[PDB]
Amino acid sequence: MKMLEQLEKKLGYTFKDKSLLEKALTHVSYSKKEHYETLEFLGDALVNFFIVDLLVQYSPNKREGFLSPLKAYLISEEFFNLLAQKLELHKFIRIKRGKINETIIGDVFEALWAAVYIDSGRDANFTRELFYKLFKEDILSAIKEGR
Amino acid sequence: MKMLEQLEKKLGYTFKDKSLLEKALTHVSYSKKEHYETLEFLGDALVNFFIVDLLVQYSPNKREGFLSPLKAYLISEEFFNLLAQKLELHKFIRIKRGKINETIIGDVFEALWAAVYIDSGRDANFTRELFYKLFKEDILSAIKEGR
């Protein structure tokens, strides 16, 4: 369809179980029985780790006072939306009632990485490094800019 | 006095960089130059991930509603100290002015895990396994422990 799962080519990764990927992309308004909500919950903590790990390695200054606000931006909806563009998740998400929002794209973006993690055999290094190959550039840049 | 790092024996891990271990148990009070501050910033995200991945895996109700208040119990001070006590970390911490603070042995438990992770060569899988080895039965129990 519109979907086709050609996201995996944008993503650089091919899913084993294709139901995973779909559950990450599916809003509850499309499906109340199989949507992204629990993937999202895992994906928030996962991605948070990926970003805090990078941040502590590439930040000009290693003080919590400099890190936390920067951390705050790098895990925000606006930033996640900036990173999702590259994947253009809004083409593959399935939702019902006309309320796609930017917070949903962030939800899905977080769910997506949780989906890659699990479909990878819960391998965090691989998944970490896959996140880095796609977004490290953009993160270092934001880190460059500060704020 | 009461050190000699039997903690590596408590933990089941030997640091290739003993100084790294040391910095994780040292509050600024004992050294404004080499304390647990940045490791803490890393292990919070680190430890947040390990516990959420467990939550999301073994929790009965895979719902944001159930998860998130169950979650904030697991990453709660009370639990963290609970976990720490199986390492008697309280006694290996190097703070000045006898002001331990229950919400300081929480920062050291986190720093300690960032320290293992980094020393291990940034190996998330390994570190998560060591963490589970040490505390999954607790969490899996604390989770089914009502609500």
Swiss-Prot record, chains A, B:
The active site is at D44, E110. Binds 2 Mg(2+) per subunit. Mn(2+) also supports catalytic activity. Optimum temperature is 70-85 degrees Celsius. GO terms for biological process: mRNA processing; regulation of gene expression; RNA processing; rRNA processing; tRNA processing. GO terms for cellular component: cytosol. It is found in: Cytoplasm. Its main location: cytoplasm. It catalyses: Endonucleolytic cleavage to 5'-phosphomonoester. Its cofactor is Mg(2+). Optimum pH is 8-9. Mg(2+) binds at E40, D107, E110. Residues 4-121 form the RNase III domain. Digests double-stranded RNA. Involved in the processing of primary rRNA transcript to yield the immediate precursors to the large and small rRNAs (23S and 16S). Also processes some mRNAs, and tRNAs when they are encoded in the rRNA operon. Probably processes pre-crRNA and tracrRNA of type II CRISPR loci if present in the organism. This is Ribonuclease 3. The gene is rnc. The chain holds residues 1 to 147 of 221 of the full protein.
